[PDB]
Amino acid sequence: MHLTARGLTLDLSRPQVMGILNVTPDSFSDGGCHNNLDQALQHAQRMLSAGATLIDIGGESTRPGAAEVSEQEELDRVVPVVEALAQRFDVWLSVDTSKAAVITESAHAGAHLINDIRSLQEPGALEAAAKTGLPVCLMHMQGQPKNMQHSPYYDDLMTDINRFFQHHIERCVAAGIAKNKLLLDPGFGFGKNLAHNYQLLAHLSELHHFELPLLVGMSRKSMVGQLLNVPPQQRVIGSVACAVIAAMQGAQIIRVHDVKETVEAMCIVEATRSA
Amino acid sequence: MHLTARGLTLDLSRPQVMGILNVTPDSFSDGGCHNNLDQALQHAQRMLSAGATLIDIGGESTRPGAAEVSEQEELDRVVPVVEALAQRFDVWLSVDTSKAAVITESAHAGAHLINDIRSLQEPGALEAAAKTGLPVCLMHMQGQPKNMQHSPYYDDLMTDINRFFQHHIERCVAAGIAKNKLLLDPGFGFGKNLAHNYQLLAHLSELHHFELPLLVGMSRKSMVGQLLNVPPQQRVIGSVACAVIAAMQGAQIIRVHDVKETVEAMCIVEATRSAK
């Protein structure tokens, strides 16, 4: 009932908020905001103060149409941030990356969790993650960020997601990553149209059958934007609503831009579930 | 599913947002704000633009420890606002009142719904409501605003609420108000402690067994305040979270101060519910 890494524990009996720290110039909602060290550190402290129990550090945007980032570039964006945070704060450090080198160097810098939207499918990533001994989040995606929003299609969405997770859990275990080190994310917005996203949100509780923690990320995405017809920074309410729905179905970790609001909503959820 | 009055159709297949217009000096979160005509009309416009499909007008705060308000004082606060709103906007008007004179005179002025927190129990209120033919919302409360929060107690909370509703549905039907014109509100914060409120919220879907629309009011209340430790105006997120939880369980009407936020949240709720 707790996740663990390097002496840290995380309470999975109540919703946990993961604060998003983009260290990119081009992230869809906040590129260029926390792009440098003192600003990143400031934003992380703000999220911690607002009640985040994990900080997700990402140096590669993976939005629809996102450009490629070189190994060295991603390393330069990510590892000094991990290092500075690891030295200052008692909090879970998640690294949103798919690269083997970033996985390894971030682990050396003191990271706790590998958040890979590509589920360790890049060359060397599976072996690199294995050697870290750290927990790993596997995420469902149809296609790649360059083409995932070109005609998304499913015979049955939940069936595909289940098969994907079953296949990749097996890969991880065979590579020496214990099943209990794994987290599952059905990947909202990743090769899924508006209907798919809400179908998934409506059916989210079905994914508990794997008996692994669920992590979800809907914050400021087009699944909110397309319904409300508002820019990313004005999607806080819609994003919080999605968080509440997900958490009411027992999703354990919520990945968000707007930590304070999400934390406040999770309090209400927690009080409702425990009654 | 489908409610109508005065030739206007309230779709209840999707969550509806009721916007709060307090015409009082002492309401718990906003007393004195929209306390005069021009500003009442101003505030109602803003709620309409934000997507509210009902405007709830209330001239008597009923917060824990609220003072009584004279009949003449209530009529003066409420009826000129109802009048101006009916003569100006194409929307459902709700009156949050318990007084027979206020019921009658508000209906005369063009109201669409009687929102009574005392469930027509005041002398002459039941008869006055009958004579209008208008839909009535019946709310559960233990005690009275003056004492309701002095040791709220229930053997079983949901059982009591059901029994309360069964009895007052019967009172209304007998007096000539047809069942299909009734709405039920379990009355969050009315003679209920923190535990009771969240028990009620967790079990809200059980009340669908009456096959009557549910209205709920949690906006900015102490059930949010006690958890978040922020003042009434900072309770928007907590209030929206309660609204989402309620609407996911199929509650049809959500009574709120912050309309824009609630409407956006309801859009997300609607997209989720209709995705089988």
Ligand SMILES: C=C1CN=c2nc(N)[nH]c(=O)c2=N1
């Ligand atoms: C935009 C992003 C970037 N990284 C993510 N990581 C996870 N695990 N889940 C997401 O939904 C997600 N969205």
Ligand SMILES: C=C1CN=c2nc(N)[nH]c(=O)c2=N1
């Ligand atoms: C504070 C108030 C004033 N009027 C209300 N009316 C209804 N129907 N429900 C409420 O929760 C409510 N709370």
Ligand SMILES: Nc1ccc(C(=O)O)cc1
């Ligand atoms: N990485 C992603 C960023 C944003 C979205 C989205 O807005 O749907 C999807 C994926």
Ligand SMILES: Nc1ccc(C(=O)O)cc1
């Ligand atoms: N009329 C009411 C006003 C406020 C509250 C509350 O804050 O719980 C309850 C009733």
Ligand SMILES: [Mg+2]
């Ligand atoms: Mg990112």
Ligand SMILES: [Mg+2]
């Ligand atoms: Mg009031």
